[PDB]
Write a protein that binds this ligand. Structure first.
Ligand code: DGL
Ligand code: DGL
Ligand code: CA
Ligand code: CA
Lengths: 267, 267
C-alpha cells in the first residue's frame, strides 16, 4: 500500500541520479534500488535483450511488493516502458519524457542536443519525444559508449574522464546548442566535466532528476504517497555485481557514509 | 484518441482559470469547457448534491468523446474526484493536490492560508492534503461565500469587490501567513484585489493554474497528447446559463474577442 517502497532499476549506478533527487524531493518515501551491474552496459545490447533484463529486474522488485516502479534507465525506458506499464497494476515511470519536456522549456535558440547510449540513440526516443512536442526544435543526438565504463570504474572525476568527454563531445562543439540532455542516467555523474566541455552557456538537462517531479505528482494522482514521516525501514540497495564497488560509488555520490548494498543474482 | 479534446467542468466561469493556463502551456490541445452557471454556486450545496451535478457535467462531456476530464472546481474535486476517477476509463484531474504541492514548496514560515467555498473548507480537503505532505505547516482555512457571486455578476474589478474582499479577508490579517491558496477556481479573477488586501509579501497560489503542469505530464504518462499542431476543431464553451453573460466574462478574461458559448441543459 502507501507505505510500500518505490522501486528503481538501472544497469548500474546510473539510476542513482534519479534516487539522489528523490532523496531530496521525497524524503519520506522508502526506496529500493537495483542496479544490474553484472550485465552493465545495457547500451550496446539488443532491444529484446534489454527488455528481458529489465523484466528480470522488475520481477525482482515486484517480489519486494513495491507500489511504483521507476525505470531509472534511458536505455531500458526506450524499449521496455510501454510493455511493462501495460502489464503492471502499479504505476511505471520512465525517464525520457520528463527530460524532453524540460529541455523544450529551457531552449532559447531551439538547438537541443541529446547524449546517450547506443541503444537510446538507436531507438530515437528523445528525437521522437521532442518532435511530438515542438517540431521546430533542431535535435542533435550522439551516442557516447565510453561514458558508462568510466562512471562504473569510479573514475568520473579523473583526468581519464575529462579526456574521454572532451574527445567524444567534440562532435557537438560546432552546432551552437544552448541545451544538452544527459540522456543516460550515468551521465550526471560526469556533469561537471560535461559542463566545462560544453561551456557555461549550455543548459544541461538531467532527465533522471526531472523525473522525480513526475513521480511526486503520480503519488498524488494515484493516491499512494507514504505518510509524511521517515519510513520505519531503511532504503535498500541491490546489485548483481560487487557490493563493495557499488557502495564506494553510491556512498560518495549520494553523500551517505557507510551505505551498504547487497549482491544478488538475476537469471 | 490523442486528437480528442480535454474536457473541463466547473460551476461557472471559475474553471476558466484552469483553461486560460492550459491555452498557455498546451497550445495544441483541444479544449471543451462546461460551466453549470444555472446551478452556481456549488459552494453552499450539500456534498451529495455537488457529486450528482458534477457527474452530470462529466457525463455531458464524456458524450463529446473527451480523452481526459479536468474537474476545474475545488468544490467538486473535494467531494467527487475519487469516485469519478475510479469509474472512468480516462484520466480525471482534480485541482486541489496541485495547489497543495505548490503551496508547500513556496512557504518559508510554514504558515499557509487557504480560501475557498463553504463546501471546500467544510471538506477540509486542503488541510488534509497539506498535512499529508508537511504536518509542520500550520494551515489557516477560510470560506468566502461572497466571492463567487461578484465574479459571476462580472464585478470582479469593481469597487464593490474591493470592499467585500477586504471585509472577508480581515479574518486572515495578522496571522503571519506568507502563502495563501486561492482554493476556489473563481478566485484568481479577484487576484489583484486579494493580493492588495494580503500583502505583496504573500505568495498567492492559483490551484487551477498549477494543475495544468500535472495535466501536461499526464498526457505524456498516458501517452494521449495531441499532435504538435493547432487542432482542426476550435475550443468549445458550454453553460447552463446565459450564453451572452458567459461570453462577456470569458472573452474578457481569456482575451478572446467574440468568443462564443452554447447554452445547454443538464438534468
Ligand atoms: N544508465 C542507463 C544504461 C547505461 C548502460 O548500461 O549502458 C541509461 O540511462 O542509458
Ligand atoms: N469554482 C468552484 C465552485 C464555486 C461555486 O460554485 O461556489 C470552486 O473552485 O470551488
Ligand atoms: Ca553504449
Ligand atoms: Ca460558498
Amino acid at each position: 500500500s502507501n507505505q510500500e517502497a518505490i522501486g528503481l532499476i538501472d544497469s548500474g549506478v546510473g539510476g542513482l541520479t534519479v534516487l539522489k533527487e528523490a532523496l531530496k524531493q521525497l524524503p519520506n518515501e522508502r526506496l529500493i534500488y537495483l542496479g544490474d551491474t553484472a550485465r552493465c552496459p545495457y547500451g550496446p545490447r539488443p532491444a529484446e535483450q534489454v527488455v528481458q533484463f529489465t523484466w528480470e529486474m522488475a520481477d525482482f522488485l515486484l517480489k519486494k511488493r513495491i507500489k511504483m516502479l521507476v525505470i531509472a534507465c534511458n536505455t531500458a525506458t526506450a524499449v521496455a516502458l510501454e510493455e511493462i506499464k501495460a502489464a503492471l497494476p502499479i504505476p511505471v515511470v520512465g525517464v525520457i519524457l520528463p527530460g524532453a519536456r524540460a529541455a523544450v522549456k529551457v531552449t532559447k535558440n531551439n538547438k537541443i542536443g541529446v547524449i546517450g547510449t547506443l541503444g537510446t540513440i538507436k531507438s530515437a526516443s528523445y528525437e521522437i519525444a521532442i518532435k511530438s512536442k515542438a517540431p521546430a526544435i533542431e535535435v542533435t543526438s550522439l551516442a557516447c559508449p565510453k561514458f558508462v565504463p568510466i562512471v562504473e570504474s569510479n573514475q568520473y572525476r579523473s583526468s581519464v574522464a575529462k579526456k574521454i568527454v572532451a574527445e567524444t563531445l567534440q562532435a557537438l562543439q560546432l552546432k551552437g546548442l544552448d541545451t544538452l540532455i544527459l540522456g543516460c542516467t550515468h551521465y550526471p555523474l560526469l556533469r561537471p566535466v560535461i559542463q566545462n566541455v560544453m561551456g557555461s552557456h549550455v543548459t544541461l538537462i538531467d532527465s533522471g532528476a526531472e523525473t522525480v517531479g513526475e513521480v511526486s505528482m503520480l503519488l498524488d494522482y494515484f493516491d499512494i504517497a507514504h505518510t509524511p514521516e521517515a519510513p520505519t525501514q531503511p532504503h535498500e540497495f541491490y546489485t548483481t555485481g560487487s557490493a563493495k564497488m557499488f557502495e564506494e560509488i553510491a556512498s560518495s555520490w549520494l553523500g551517505i557514509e557507510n551505505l551498504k548494498a547487497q549482491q544478488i543474482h538475476l537469471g
